[PDB]
Every structure is written in structure tokens, then in C-alpha cells.
Structure 1
Amino acid sequence: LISKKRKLVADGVFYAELNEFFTRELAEEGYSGVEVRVTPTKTEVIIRATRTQDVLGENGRRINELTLLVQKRFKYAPGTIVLYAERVQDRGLSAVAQAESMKFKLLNGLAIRRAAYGVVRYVMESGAKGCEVVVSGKLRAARAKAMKFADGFLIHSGQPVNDFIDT
């Protein structure tokens, strides 16, 4: 009934908002990303991630209640939604996941140089072409500064960075 313009953008913000939800709540579960596939009478949400049974819950208790929550939120009907999960291979090739793991290491209280050396070691032995991480803020100090850790070559300009790099 509504225009396809606002249809599409509502689908876009729909994706964005549920992505915000899921990178919030499934953050400690090795989240990476999600994908609705539209269907007649149905719509489906894989979650590319690592800790699969953890996001499921017992007999999928967690995913069931998540379906109920998101459905009640978006005023969908029951049965309109199905969720799945995907133990993605090459865990190192997911900037979001590696950053989240780094975050939990930090909150645990791990040495940050140690952590970053370890993370980029893990990436480049997972078999990337170039890795990069960076910190900025208060760091064993009272004044702002940064650090950096990297190896291999990278790029900064072009459709190459629009496509190849994960950020």
C-alpha cells in the first residue's frame, strides 16, 4: 500500500535496529552479523557467529523468547519469523568479533599490548593479508594518546577498501 521508497528504507532501518539489538545482547556470544531473507509469508534471520548453542539456549529457549520479543516489538504475527545460527569458519576474519573479544579481555583486565599482539597474531595466522588495531584514550596515564599494532600491507583509498577490508 505504501511507496516502495519508504518500504525499502524501512527495511533498511529494520535491519539496522535489529543489528543494534543483536550486537548488544549477543555481544558476548561471538556475534558477527545477521541476514533476513525475505520470503512470502516468512522472513528469516541467520546470525553469523561462533557460540551457536549459547545463542540458541536450551532447546532453543533463547531464540524462542527472542522471536517472541522481536515479534511483539515489530508487531509481526507469530510464525512470521524464523531464526537460524551459523558457526562461521575463519573466525579471525571478522573485525567485529575480534574487537568484541578484545573488549572482554580488556574488561577482564588483560595487558593491552599483549592482547593486541595476540589478536593480530591470531588473525594473520588465520590467514589474512594485513591486520590493524588501534587504541585511543587514557592508558596507564592521565592524558589521551594512542597505540597501534599491525603487520602486512593494507590500503586506505578506493573501492578496494569499500569491498575487501572488514572494519
Structure 2
Amino acid sequence: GPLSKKRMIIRDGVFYAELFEFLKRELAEEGFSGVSYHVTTLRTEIVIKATKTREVLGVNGRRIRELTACIQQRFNYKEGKLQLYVERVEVRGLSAMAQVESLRFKLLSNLQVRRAAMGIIRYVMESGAKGCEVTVGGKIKGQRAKSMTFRDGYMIKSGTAHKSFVDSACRHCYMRAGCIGVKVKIMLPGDSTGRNGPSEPLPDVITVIEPK
């Protein structure tokens, strides 16, 4: 029987959740910045966003075919019905998932916490971001655990508008003494096109037309 329309979207959501999780673990070393799919009658067209496009494709498209085999076998895709593409992030410093993975890799490379977190913040605001906040917590200064937050710029924290103007991501960094949690929130600037911006004015800002 056809699944109820309320059961088809649940299946579609659960499938995307698993697909997102698989690529997060597989493409952690690259700046995996989301995945989108477009199911048509002929194929599926799964598209992967990452900062290091060359590292996810491999040589002569080796790794992207390994990922295609992974998804094909997991979800039982007939041959030729699944296609995978990878596209580059327009602004690397405006992606919280790419910046949080960069920060986690810095910490695992024995970088200093204040130096690494500060280095992320400058790069984020060199890219045109309105604000940025980086949080690092865990066993940084000894047996006792402390959480240190570094801020710069604007950042709204209340209401629902902060879910469309702020890009956020968190990661677990497993160090020798224990796991360390890193959070990166980036307040996106507005865009006329909306390609890498919320594309709407701030909910509280009120501009007045200059008389002509």
C-alpha cells in the first residue's frame, strides 16, 4: 500500500538525518557544510557541500564513488538511480560547520586554546560576518574543567530570528585528558540574493527611505 503522506515525510526526514550523520563522520577532515538531494523519477542527485572539494573527490573521482557505493548499499539503490555531486562553499568563513571542524582540527594538533579560538574569530570576520562567538570547554587548564568564550561583533541570542541570522555548530574534540567541546556561532550578514545570507532585514531594524 502507498505509505500515508504523513508517513512518507517521516521516512524522508529520517533518511536525510542518517545521510547527514554519515557524511559528517566520513567527511570530518574536510569542511563538510551540508548535503542536499533532489529526488526525481530518473535519479536522486545527492549534492555534498565541502570546503576541500579535491579531498572528497579523490583521484579521478575515487572517493566520491566510494561514498556513492556506501549510500547505494545502505539504502538499496538500483544501479544508475543514484548520483553524487560535490560543490564548493562560496564563503568558507561564513560556514559554522566548516569553522568548527577547523577549530577542532587545530586543537587536536596541539594548538593553544586562546590562540586557536582567536584565529577562528579573525578569519570569520575577515569574510564579512557581522559577529562570531567561539566557546571551548573541558579539561583545558588541569583536572578542573573551565569554559572560555571568545566574542567579537554583534550577536542576537533571543527570539526566533536568531535561527535565520546565526549559523551555529558544535563538535567533540577527544584529547588525551578527555573530550573537549567546541562551539562556533556566526552571525550572517544580510544578502540581496540570499545566497549566503538570511536575505531579510533584522526584525528590529527600521530604515526610512531617503526622499528623492
For normalisation by structure 2, the TM-score amounts to 0.76
1:31 aligns with 2:48: no
Q: Give the residue type in structure 2 aligned to 1:6.
A: R
Distance 1:35 1:163 in 2: 18
The aligned residue for residue 130 of structure 2 is: 129
> Which residue number in structure 2 is paired with residue 140 of structure 1?
141
The answer (yes or no) to whether the contact 1:30–1:50 under 8 Å persists in 2 is yes
Q: Deviations over 1:78-137 (max 9, x none)?
A: 111111111111100111110101111111110110011110000011110010010111
Percent same amino acid at aligned positions?
60
CA distance in 2, matches of 1:4, 1:67: 28
SS at match of 1:32: coil
Q: Secondary structure at the match of 2:33?
A: strand
Report how many residues are paired. Answer: 167
Counterpart-to-counterpart distance in 2, 1:59 and 1:6? 40
Map Cα deviations across residues 8-39 of structure 1 (whole Å, 9 max, x no partner): 11111111101101011111012111000121
Match of residue 7 from structure 1: 8
Question: Relative to total residues, which structure has the larger helix share, 1 or 2?
Answer: 1
**Equivalent runs, 1:51-130 vs 2, <5 Å:** 51-130=52-131
For 1:140, give the aligned amino acid: K
**Amino acid in structure 2 at the alignment position of 1:82:** Q
Per-residue deviation, 1:159: 2.2
Find the aligned partners of 2:139 and 2:167 in 1 and give their Cα distance: 26
Q: Secondary structure at the residue paired with 2:162? A: helix
TM-score (norm 1): 0.96
Asked if structure 2 preserves the Cα contact closer than 8 Å seen for 1:93 and 1:128, the reply is yes
Larger Rg: 2
Gaps of 5+ in 1: none
- Structure 1 residue runs of 4 or more that deviate by more than 3 Å after TM superposition: none
Please give the per-residue CA displacement for 1:54-77, whole angstroms capped at 9, x wherever unaligned: 101111111112111211111121
Matched residue type, 1:147:
M
